[PDB]
Amino acid sequence: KVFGRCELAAAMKRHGLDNYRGYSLGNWVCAAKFESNFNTQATNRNTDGSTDYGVLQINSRWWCNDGRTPGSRNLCNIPCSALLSSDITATVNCAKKIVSDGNGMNAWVAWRNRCKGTDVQAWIRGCRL
């Protein structure tokens, strides 16, 4: 599913991501824009053989099982395909584990490079939340 900016903002908000670990909603939406362009079906393979899945581009090396990443840890206890669903619930639950892990949103390279230190509030501007 390709979400609209505000539609995603509203689902992430409903899912308890606003200010989750001190990260305002705009951060979350910014990261999604840059990681997958708001498409839940986005996949991208990495050099190490791992693959990133979904709107937040969660990696199969640590977070989810895809059956083809040797030495995967499956910390979120889910099949990576679950992360491509139109229902963002599994993405959200798993992102909450990731962000709690120590480096915060820096786990998201596009966030670090494209969102971090920018006026992220722009991402939820005009939205009815």
Curated annotation (Swiss-Prot):
* InterPro entries per the UniProt record, alphabetical: Glyco_hydro_22, Glyco_hydro_22_CS, Glyco_hydro_22_lys, Lysozyme-like_dom_sf
**Binding residues for substrate:** 101
Q: Does the keyword Hydrolase apply?
A: yes
GO cellular component assignments: cytoplasm; endoplasmic reticulum; extracellular space
Q: Which GO terms describe its biological process?
A: cell wall macromolecule catabolic process; defense response to bacterium; defense response to Gram-negative bacterium; defense response to Gram-positive bacterium; killing of cells of another organism
Q: Which domain of life is it from?
A: Eukaryota
Keywords of the record, alphabetical order, are:
Allergen, Antimicrobial, Bacteriolytic enzyme, Disulfide bond, Glycosidase, Hydrolase, Secreted, Signal
Q: Which reaction does it catalyse?
A: Hydrolysis of (1->4)-beta-linkages between N-acetylmuramic acid and N-acetyl-D-glucosamine residues in a peptidoglycan and between N-acetyl-D-glucosamine residues in chitodextrins
Q: What is its main location?
A: secreted
Q: Which GO terms describe its molecular function?
A: beta-N-acetylglucosaminidase activity; identical protein binding; lysozyme activity
Q: Which CDD domains match?
A: LYZ_C
Database matches in Gene3D superfamilies: 1.10.530.10
Q: List the disulfide bonds.
A: 6-127, 30-115, 64-80, 76-94
Pinpoint the C-type lysozyme domain residues: 1-129
Any idea where this protein resides?
A: Secreted
Q: What class of enzyme is it?
A: hydrolase
- Report if keyword Secreted is assigned: yes
Which catalytic residues are annotated?
35, 52
What single Pfam family name could you report for this chain, choosing any that match?
Lys
What additional remark is attached to this entry? Lysozyme C is capable of both hydrolysis and transglycosylation; it also shows a slight esterase activity. It acts rapidly on both peptide-substituted and unsubstituted peptidoglycan, and slowly on chitin oligosaccharides.
Similarity section: Belongs to the glycosyl hydrolase 22 family.
Q: How does it assemble?
A: Monomer.
Function, as annotated: Lysozymes have primarily a bacteriolytic function; those in tissues and body fluids are associated with the monocyte-macrophage system and enhance the activity of immunoagents. Has bacteriolytic activity against M.luteus.
Name under which the protein is recorded: Lysozyme C
Natural source organism: Gallus gallus (Chicken)
